[PDB]
Structure formats: structure tokens, C-alpha cells
Amino acid sequence: DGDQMISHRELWAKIANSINDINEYLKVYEHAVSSYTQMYQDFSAVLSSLAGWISPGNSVKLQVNSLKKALEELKEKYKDKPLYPANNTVSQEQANKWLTELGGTIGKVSQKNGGYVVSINMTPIDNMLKSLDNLGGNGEVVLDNAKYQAWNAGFSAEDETMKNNLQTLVQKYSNANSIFDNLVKVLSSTIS
Amino acid sequence: DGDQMISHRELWAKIANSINDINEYLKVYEHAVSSYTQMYQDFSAVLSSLAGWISPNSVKLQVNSLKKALEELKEKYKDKPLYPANNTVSQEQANKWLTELGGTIGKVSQKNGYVVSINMTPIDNMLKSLDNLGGNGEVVLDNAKYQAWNAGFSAEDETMKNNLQTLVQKYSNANSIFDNLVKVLSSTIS
């Protein structure tokens, strides 16, 4: 039973196969971080442009159509850029396994071509688009210093929501790298 | 070289030997985390007692009360080190583990025999920052002086907090390497 023999040559093949299996596991994390960094980058640009989209109206006059147009273009930009698998698609239970691995809030499962993918969770974008529409009025809307301060607080709260979501995603990727590094060091130091 | 054959029993043995070797890594990490955690818990207790040492518009500070508390914490952990938990090791044994854990978390001391004691440079900086304050116990400081001192005091606190956090992460990462290696050994059998 345990008398079956294998060569050193066959072991290195089994090691190299498992090495490639973990590398593609890391490249999923690598792409997931890269696409969420870009999404947060473009979002932070919308928040930096906010200063040029507000003006005095004691109160302030907010250009809603300019801000809503930028968020719509941002949501449309990452409609076809998912966190995983960046190409083709996988099954539904497979996408749910990666959603739970990456975090439920940072990702969102959706199907594209029969199968399913893990698209970027655009809930803070949707929440920012609905909060604007509830400031009833075509074009620009005037709000007192108190209401704008509360609306701007929720805007910065969603911005910090993405900032910490990205930081934990980077930490998981950094941890997986160190776990892979020492794992390869261990497997090589054994047959050395 | 590559034509050499090994049996399935030698496979299970070769994996188990590396698993017992990495378990010795976890034995060091587990204790070192436990020793630095108890120190930061005792230090966190001193922070909870800081509210009773400041009082009112300037502030008053029982400098000698906080000084003796910090100095007692260091003397408590002067003999309780990070590694080894018992006895001692060689010089290059403590230096290799100092580099593994980080040159900032620990300090290599000599016992007849070397040991990696807990690095107390944050406590030393706090004590000199307190000694730079006024004399004879209680000290009066305006709001500006308390803002600056508490800023550097919170910085040294956050330094130990980050030191403990990164050490736990290495221990969590080192445990998952043990877990994954166990998964391969269990799969090879059957």
C-alpha cells in the first residue's frame, strides 16, 4: 500500500504544479486589488472635484448634474471590470467562494455570459446617486449650511468606507504573499 | 540524481519532519506573542489609570506617580523575555530570531548565554519625556504643553500597538503555513 515508489523527478513535477496553482491564486488577489485601487482612485477624483462644483447660494448651491454625471460615468466604467476572474467567467458557487474570501462588502456577484463573476460592489456609488436625487430640483439645488454639512459627511463616510475596504484587501494580498513565500521556502528547504 | 526513487513512507516522514520543524517556529512565535501581549495589557492598565493622574484652564500631572508606574512595568518585564521562555540560547541564535521578529520589537540581552528580552525603548522615551517636565511630583502645564506631550505619548503607545499587531499577523501567517502543510500530509494518506 505504502510501498509504492516515486522518483525525486516526479516530486518536483508535483511541486511545480502546486506552485502554479498558488500563483494564479495570487494573481486573482493581485488583479482584485488593482481594479479596486483604480475604482477608488477615480472616486477620490470625484471628491476632489467637488470643491469646484459647489458655490454660495449663508447657504451653498450644489451642481447636482455635474456630480451625478461623474458618478454615472464611474459606475459605467466599472460595469465590465470585475474583481474576478478578469476574463471569461466561473460558476455561481465559485464566485460566492471568492466573494466570501475577498469580503462581502467589497465585491458583488453578477452574471455576464451564462456564468457568474464577482463585479466591483458599487453600493457606495449607488448610495451617492440616490442621496443626490432626494435633493429635489432640476440642475442645482440650494441647501443650508447644516444640511450640506450632513450630506457632505455621508459623502466622506462612503469615501472612507472604500478607503478601509481597500486597505484590508491589500492586507490580505500581502498576507497571502508571505504565506506563499515561506511555503515555497519550506518545500525547497526539505529536498535540499 | 533525479532518477533516485523514494517510497511513500519516506514521503510521509519527510513531510512530518518539516512539520515538526515549523512547529518549533510556532512554539517561539506563540510565546513571544503572549509575552508582548501581557506587557501591553499591563501598559494599557497604566493608560486606564492616567485619567486619575491629570486634573484641571491648565492641567496638573502627577509626574512621579506616572514615572514610578512606568518604571515598575519595565522592572517587571526585565526578567520576562520574548525568547527563549526558559534557560538561554547562543548569541547568533538570539540574533537570527531578533531579525525574524524585527529589530524594533525585541532586544538581545546577555545571561551568563543570550536572550531576546522585550524592547522597552518606548517606555524609556516616555520616561525621558516625563523627566523633561517640571520637578517635584505634581506639575502644572498649560493646554499647549499637555497637547504636545500627550501627542508623543500616544505615539509611543501606538508604536507598541503596531508592534503587537504585526507580530500577531506573523504568528497567524505562520499558523496558516502549518495548516496548509498539514492539509498536504493528510491528503497524501488515502
Numbering used by the authors:
A (entry chain C): 124 to 180, 185 to 319
B (entry chain A): 124 to 179, 185 to 240, 242 to 319
Which sentences from the paper describe this structure?
Like many Gram-negative pathogens, Shigella rely on their type three secretion system (T3SS) to inject effector proteins into eukaryotic host cells, driving both cellular invasion and evasion of host immune responses. Here, we uncover critical mechanistic details of the Shigella-specific DOC signaling process by describing the role of a π-helix secondary structure element within the T3SS tip protein invasion plasmid antigen D (IpaD).
These N-terminal truncation constructs expressed and purified well in E. coli and diffracting crystals of IpaDΔ1–121, WT and IpaDΔ1–121, ΔQ148 formed overnight by vapor diffusion. When the proximal (bottom) regions of the structures are aligned, a modest translation of the distal portion of the structure is observed in the mutant relative to that of the WT. Importantly, however, elimination of the π-helix does not impact the registry of the surrounding residues or significantly alter the positioning of the adjacent side chains, supporting the feasibility of this mutant as a means to independently dissect the role of the π-helix in IpaD. Fortunately, a 3.00 Å structure of IpaDΔQ148 verified the removal of the π-helix (conversion to α-helix) and minimal impact on the global structure of the mutant, consistent with the CD data for both constructs. However, removing the π-helix moves the tyrosine side chain approximately 2.4 Å away from the helix interface and the phenylalanine is no longer prevented from adopting the necessary rotamer conformation that supports DOC binding in this region.
